[PDB]
Design a protein around this ligand. Structure first.
Ligand SMILES: CC(C)[C@@H]1CC[C@@H](C)C[C@H]1OC(=O)[C@H]1C[C@@H]1C(=O)O
Length: 133
């Protein structure tokens, strides 16, 4: 029952500061504009120790599978080649991506009936809110 409250299908309902987050990460103009328009469905599932997160939108469909605490290589939707580790820290799923001497963190937490996503790159934070589909 690792991650029970995260599991399911979720739909984006609000975003704040996401263009600025993407700028800080280094995403180019055209990608920012099309990615910032996306309204993804996030599908989280667990099978034994393996967690899978799928993000599906008109911009890109991505899928990552991982074991908590065990690093993996990831090609992001904006085409960064990153080394990622996802841990559970006090009930928060913490996803760190490292590439080119940089780092960014994406935190997912359950808050009321929502799944709140916080994206941080240096001093720039963005909040995304998901509801059950
Ligand atoms: C549109 C998506 C695929 C963007 C693409 C640019 C990249 C820098 C960040 C990436 O966001 C994400 O992975 C997840 C935080 C977004 C969320 O949960 O909604």
């Amino acid at each position: 029952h690792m991650c029970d409250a995260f599991v399911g299908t979720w739909k984006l309902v609000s975003s704040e500061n996401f263009d600025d987050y993407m700028k800080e990460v280094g995403v180019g103009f055209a990608t920012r504009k099309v990615a910032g328009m996306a309204k993804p469905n996030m599908i989280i599932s667990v099978n034994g120790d393996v967690i899978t997160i799928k993000s599906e939108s008109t911009f890109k469909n991505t899928e990552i599978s991982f074991i908590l605490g065990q690093e993996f290589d990831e090609v992001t939707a904006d085409d960064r080649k990153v080394k990622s580790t996802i841990t559970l820290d006090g009930g928060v799923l913490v996803h760190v991506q490292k590439w080119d001497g940089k780092s960014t963190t994406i935190k997912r937490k359950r808050e009321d009936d929502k799944l709140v996503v916080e994206c941080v790159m240096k001093g720039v934070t963005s909040t995304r809110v998901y509801e059950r589909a």
